[PDB]
Amino acid sequence: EEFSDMLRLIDYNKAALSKFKQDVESALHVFKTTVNSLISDQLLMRNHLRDLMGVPYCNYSKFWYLEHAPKCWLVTNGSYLNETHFSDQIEQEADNMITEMLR
Amino acid sequence: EEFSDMLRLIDYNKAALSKFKQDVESALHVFKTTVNSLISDQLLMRNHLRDLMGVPYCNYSKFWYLEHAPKCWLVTNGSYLNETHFSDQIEQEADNMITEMLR
Amino acid sequence: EEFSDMLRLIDYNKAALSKFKQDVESALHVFKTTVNSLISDQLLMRNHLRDLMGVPYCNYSKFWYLEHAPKCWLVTNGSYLNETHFSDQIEQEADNMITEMLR
Numbered sequence: 001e002e003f004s005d006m007l008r009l010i011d012y013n014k015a016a017l018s019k020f021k022q023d024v025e026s027a028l029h030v031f032k033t034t035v036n037s038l039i040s041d042q043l044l045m046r047n048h049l050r051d052l053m054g055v056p057y058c059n060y061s062k063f064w065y066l067e068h069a070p071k072c073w074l075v076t077n078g079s080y081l082n083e084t085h086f087s088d089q090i091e092q093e094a095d096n097m098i099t100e101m102l103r
Numbered sequence: 104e105e106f107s108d109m110l111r112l113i114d115y116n117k118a119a120l121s122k123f124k125q126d127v128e129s130a131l132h133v134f135k136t137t138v139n140s141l142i143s144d145q146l147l148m149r150n151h152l153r154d155l156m157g158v159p160y161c162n163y164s165k166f167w168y169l170e171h172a173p174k175c176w177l178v179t180n181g182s183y184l185n186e187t188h189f190s191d192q193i194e195q196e197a198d199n200m201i202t203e204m205l206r
Numbered sequence: 207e208e209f210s211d212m213l214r215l216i217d218y219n220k221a222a223l224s225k226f227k228q229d230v231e232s233a234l235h236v237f238k239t240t241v242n243s244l245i246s247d248q249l250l251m252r253n254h255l256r257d258l259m260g261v262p263y264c265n266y267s268k269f270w271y272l273e274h275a276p277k278c279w280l281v282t283n284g285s286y287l288n289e290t291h292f293s294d295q296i297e298q299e300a301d302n303m304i305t306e307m308l309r
């Protein structure tokens with residue numbers, strides 16, 4: 001069946017996207033952990049170096065800065081990256097549609 | 104219609120990819136802003152620490168280094184990350200094909 | 207043919223995903239190179255600043271930390287990011303199925 005072959009093509013596209021989303025999530029977890037470690041060490045350095053004491057903080061808060069973005073310090077204990085977890089709401093709706101179709 | 108159901112499956116795959124591209128773009132903007140802040144603070148530190156004055160710069164330019172990649176300094180004011188914006192050229196061509204099909 | 211039009215829609219979804227995977231791989235290579243340069247410079251700084259000599263290393267190894275994640279140093283010469291290359295196993299299986307279908 002040509003019908004069967006087209007369903008298989010759709011299934012491959014769906015599976016390749018799901019695997020790529022998982023792979024990107026895994027990669028970003030490694031990047032996030034690494035960048036957070038650099039933030040922690042940079043803060044630890046700053047706290048142990050008296051020659052840096054006169055340097056002011058920019059006091060630019062996270063969200064305003066993300067929308068608007070030396071000098072002054074930009075990195076603070078508010079700079080840590082949170083985990084990235086991609087929504088599967090669309091894929092879940094597709095899965096619900098398939099279960100229904102399957103008669 | 105089986106026809107209608109298959110169009111719906113294609114539509115879900117298309118929408119899930121578009122949402123994931125937007126989500127990745129949002130995530131990379133946060134990562135980029137954070138890494139740029141670490142570059143700025145690292146440069147600010149270097150400029151205020153006399154014990155680092157004898158350390159040379161590698162003088163490896165961005166593009167050659169990206170293709171070829173302590174020691175000497177690697178990070179400079181040329182290291183800042185630019186914004187990432189993913190092409191939708193293929194999706195735009197698909198949208199043009201759909202508008203036409205729709206008779 | 208409606209058949210021909212649906213194959214074209216599947217082809218656009220497949221191509222848009224392949225292009226996006228390539229684009230993400232290109233972007234992550236730039237981010238990875240940049241973060242590795244920040245690690246190298248942070249290590250170089252630490253090695254030239256006597257005021258940091260009493261600061262201990264956390265001695266948290268990469269894999270346990272990635273699963274479990276100042277203080278002590280988190281960044282070491284074991285923190286460098288490796289290259290990210292996304293599997294195309296599913297897409298390769300789809301390509302093999304298409305070659306076969308094509309009679």
Ligand code: IUM
Pocket residue numbers: 257
């Ligand atoms: O510590 U004396 O410069």
Ligand SMILES: [Cl-]
Pocket residue numbers: 009010013014112113116117215216219220
């Ligand atoms: Cl599809």
